[PDB]
């Protein structure tokens, strides 16, 4: 019965950070802090409320008392984008807090953007797949439109976003057309569009079957 | 320094019992300062303590799995082990292998040392479907990748040039598709002067179905 709270934040680097935590009684032992990296497991930086493991950048520090305590990262840094969790030892129990999701914000930068065709080895299942791919840019937010011999596609294909990057702090996105063979091999020209903040007008890759 | 090492399935069926192993390495388990366990992460949630035990064969748990679950542990084998009866839906989760300090002397006064990689066990009643890859070909700066396509659960690697390759690689998180199965791709940005010079190689795995492929991705 711990919480957490803000659940989220965002700031910039170089920004200093405080998230808070609230046990779910009087602390009477250890109450400490981890670190989770995107897909990584979490990692100790702070025991006893506010001592670091070793190794630990002097950036990391821990406080208070009772049920109320804290974490702050005096200058936060990209390699900082992490998950936080509270964790206490009570009742001859283990138990963690929901966790904080410290994020960068940034300026806005560019997508670069390619385009790709099926492979030979893909069309033998008898299936196709087109990718575009939209590389380091910032906000998160884009919009990518396919086209297929000008004729605007909709309900055939997927997006994923990738983590945001730990040192340049922008992301990655990319977008797959799924056509079958058939619808593939019917068209010439394959496209795709792509709108962003970071753009002055939105912009298109292309190619050509032969 | 002490480290931990993940093992086991990823895949277990409804009402079958998981179970996962630990192999502890740069130092022994065989102490009164360390108490060994697991932890785990539903995807999208919070960290969930399952249990710990204590090398001597003592051990505690978390009530809520504790009718469910054993952890034992063996000090010749310097290993650890966690079997959940009953598994459903509910389990899936990424599991964790983690380390009890002892802090100060004698009193209740602990930290998780050293933690696993963690595990991405699912529960399902379907099979270990594995992936196809394929390449995406190219044809200034250019960009080359693979595509991981069609498969069943999804805890999957992807490297490139067996791990020679870092700087410029951006992987996607697994995407669902109204099929059933997963799809997954990998990219690397590359200048055009490596380009048809230096060959790019991803090298793809899945554990639960035994698969194992490498593919070069040229361009046009």
């Known amino acids: 019965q711990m919480t957490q709270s803000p659940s989220s934040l965002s700031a910039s680097v170089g920004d200093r950070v405080t998230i808070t935590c609230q046990a779910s009684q009087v602390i009477s032992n250890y109450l400490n802090w981890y670190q989770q990296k995107p897909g990584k497991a979490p990692k100790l930086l702070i025991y006893d409320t506010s001592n670091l493991k070793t190794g630990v950048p002097s950036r990391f520090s821990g406080s208070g008392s009772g049920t109320d305590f804290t974490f702050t990262i005096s200058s936060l840094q990209p390699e900082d984008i992490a998950t936080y969790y509270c964790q206490q030892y009570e009742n001859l129990q283990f138990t963690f807090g929901p966790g904080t999701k410290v994020d960068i914000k940034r300026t806005v930068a560019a997508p670069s953007v390619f385009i790709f065709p099926p492979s030979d080895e893909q069309l033998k299942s008898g299936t196709a797949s087109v990718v575009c791919l939209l590389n380091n840019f910032y906000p998160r937010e884009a919009k990518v439109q396919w086209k297929v011999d000008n004729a605007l596609q909709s309900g055939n294909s997927q997006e994923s976003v990738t983590e945001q990057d730990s040192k340049d702090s922008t992301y990655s996105l990319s977008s797959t057309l799924t056509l079958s063979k058939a619808d593939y091999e019917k068209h010439k020209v394959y496209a795709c569009e792509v709108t962003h903040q970071g753009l002055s007008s939105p912009v298109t890759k292309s190619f050509n079957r032969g | 320094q002490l480290q931990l090492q993940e093992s086991g399935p990823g895949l277990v069926k409804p009402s079958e019992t998981l179970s996962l192993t630990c192999t502890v390495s740069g130092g022994s388990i065989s102490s009164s300062s360390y108490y060994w366990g697991w932890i785990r992460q539903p995807p999208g949630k919070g960290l969930e303590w399952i249990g710990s035990?204590?090398?001597?064969?003592?051990?505690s748990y978390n009530p809520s799995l504790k009718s469910r679950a054993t952890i034992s542990v063996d000090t010749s084998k310097n290993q650890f082990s966690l079997n959940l009866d009953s598994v459903s839906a509910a389990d899936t989760a990424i599991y964790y292998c983690a380390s009890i300090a002892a802090a100060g002397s004698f009193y209740y006064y602990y930290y998780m040392d050293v933690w696993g990689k963690g595990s991405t066990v699912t529960v399902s009643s379907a099979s270990t479907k594995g992936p196809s890859v394929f390449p995406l070909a190219p044809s200034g700066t250019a960009a080359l990748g693979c595509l991981v396509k069609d498969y069943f659960p999804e805890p999957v690697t992807v490297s490139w040039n067996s791990g020679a390759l870092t700087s410029g690689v951006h992987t996607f998180p697994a995407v669902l598709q109204s099929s059933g199965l997963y799809s997954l791709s990998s990219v690397v940005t590359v200048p055009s002067s490596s380009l048809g010079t230096q060959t790019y190689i991803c090298n793809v795995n899945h554990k639960p179905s035994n698969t194992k492929v490498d593919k070069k991705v040229e361009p046009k």
């Open positions: 035990v204590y090398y001597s064969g003592g051990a």
